[PDB]
Write an enzyme that holds these catalytic residues in place. Structure first.
Site, mmCIF file in Angstrom:
data_model
loop_
_atom_site.group_PDB
_atom_site.id
_atom_site.type_symbol
_atom_site.label_atom_id
_atom_site.label_comp_id
_atom_site.label_asym_id
_atom_site.label_seq_id
_atom_site.Cartn_x
_atom_site.Cartn_y
_atom_site.Cartn_z
ATOM 1 N N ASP A 1 0.810 -1.202 0.000
ATOM 2 C CA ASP A 1 0.000 0.000 0.000
ATOM 3 C C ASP A 1 0.848 1.260 0.000
ATOM 4 O O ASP A 1 1.363 1.629 1.059
ATOM 5 C CB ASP A 1 -0.897 -0.045 1.251
ATOM 6 C CG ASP A 1 -1.886 1.096 1.393
ATOM 7 O OD1 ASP A 1 -2.026 1.888 0.435
ATOM 8 O OD2 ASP A 1 -2.495 1.222 2.476
ATOM 9 N N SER B 1 -0.984 16.246 -11.269
ATOM 10 C CA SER B 1 -1.233 15.851 -12.643
ATOM 11 C C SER B 1 -1.447 17.137 -13.473
ATOM 12 O O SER B 1 -2.059 18.083 -12.984
ATOM 13 C CB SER B 1 -2.476 14.966 -12.715
ATOM 14 O OG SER B 1 -2.644 14.439 -14.019
HETATM 15 N N1 LIG Z 1 -7.754 2.908 0.873
HETATM 16 C C1 LIG Z 1 -7.410 1.778 1.722
HETATM 17 C C2 LIG Z 1 -8.402 1.083 2.387
HETATM 18 C C3 LIG Z 1 -8.086 -0.012 3.163
HETATM 19 C C4 LIG Z 1 -6.755 -0.360 3.259
HETATM 20 F F1 LIG Z 1 -6.383 -1.412 4.037
HETATM 21 C C5 LIG Z 1 -5.801 0.377 2.580
HETATM 22 N N2 LIG Z 1 -6.150 1.405 1.840
#
Ligand SMILES: Nc1ccc(F)cn1
Length: 330
Positions: free
Chosen positions: A35, A199
């Site tokens: 992430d 952007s």
């Molecule tokens: N936008 C997000 C939502 C949940 C997560 F675990 C990570 N990112």
């Protein structure tokens, strides 16, 4: 040093991507969600509440000879979708496709919210945003990238997510065979702890390019493309029968439609998201109304260049002294 791992969509709609990560000694392989929008490396574990575990692979710190409890450390995180998790912290060995970090903070979940429980394919998350957002208290911890950076051949990591296909997260190098043309670099602001950039504009299908500054974050942890209301309204106006639905929670369109493409600007360069990437299937099982992949960011407070946009490009997260973002067509 370098690391290279394959990332895979969790389902037929590319709702999220999982990448195998080795934790502890002997190795415990957990499939994590990398992430670039968060900074906690957290996993489902032997400590997670039994009723909150449904099919995920757990990390058992007692079976790792290198796991060390970080005395008095706890973490608690809340995400943009209303989901959350919390627990205690261990330091342990973590490897991503050949690249190893010893003493990496691995946040063991004691509690996870319903959405994490319901998602059996995701065993936890691996944060790739700036360490300033890490939730560990009372001593903040560093991200996997931050800990490995000094050792990498180049202080970078790349995201090459696939559309209904496998892809790659690379650490320490740029695969010049994984993209066409050149990488265009753009400025990053780390003030909000995100890979935040501007952007230069957009185009809808074969329409004229609108030069306009769109500030947002490169977020592999968000599924969809979240843009200003004006931009999203201009996009869905090109789809017959498309409409903003309050009951569904966004723009919906007839499943029989062939969606126009969406282009975003990275300086003078353009990244084209094919129309098919913007189709998120039926709103409910068996429905002929489909969910759109481009949604308004008016309720969020920030524009999000999520998986929909990033999977159309080869993306460099450059952690040099002054961090920047690279984007190339592929
Ligand atoms: N936008 C997000 C939502 C949940 C997560 F675990 C990570 N990112």
């Amino acid at each position: 040093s370098t690391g290279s791992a394959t990332t895979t969509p969790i389902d037929s709609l590319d709702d999220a991507y999982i990448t195998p990560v080795q934790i502890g000694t002997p190795a415990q392989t957990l499939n994590l969600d990398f992430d670039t929008g968060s900074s906690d490396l957290w996993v489902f574990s032997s400590e997670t509440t039994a009723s909150e575990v449904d099919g995920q692979t757990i990390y058992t710190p007692s079976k790792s000879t290198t796991a060390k409890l970080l005395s008095g450390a706890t973490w608690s995180i809340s995400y943009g979708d209303g989901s959350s998790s919390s627990g205690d912290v261990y330091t342990d060995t973590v490897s991503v496709g050949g690249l190893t970090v010893t003493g990496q903070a691995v946040e063991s979940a004691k509690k996870v919210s319903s959405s994490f429980t319901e998602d059996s394919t995701i065993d936890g998350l691996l944060g790739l945003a700036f360490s300033t957002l890490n939730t560990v208290s009372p001593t903040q911890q560093k991200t996997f990238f931050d800990n490995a950076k000094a050792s990498l051949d180049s202080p970078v990591f790349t995201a090459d997510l696939g559309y209904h296909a496998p892809g790659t997260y690379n650490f320490g190098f740029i695969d010049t065979t994984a993209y066409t043309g050149s990488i265009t670099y753009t400025a990053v602001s780390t003030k909000q702890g995100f890979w935040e950039w501007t952007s230069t504009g957009y185009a809808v299908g074969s329409g004229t390019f609108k030069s306009t500054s769109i500030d947002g974050i490169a977020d592999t942890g968000t599924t969809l493309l979240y843009l200003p209301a004006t931009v999203v309204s201009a996009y869905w106006a090109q789809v017959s029968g498309a409409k903003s639905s309050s009951s569904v929670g966004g723009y919906v369109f007839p499943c029989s439609a062939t969606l126009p493409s969406f282009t975003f600007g990275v300086g003078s360069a353009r990244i084209v998201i094919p129309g098919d990437y913007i189709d998120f299937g039926p709103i409910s099982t068996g429905s002929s109304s489909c969910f759109g992949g481009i949604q308004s960011s008016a309720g969020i407070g920030i524009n999000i260049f999520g998986d929909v946009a990033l999977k159309a490009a080869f993306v460099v997260f450059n952690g040099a002294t002054t961090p920047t973002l690279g984007f190339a067509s592929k």
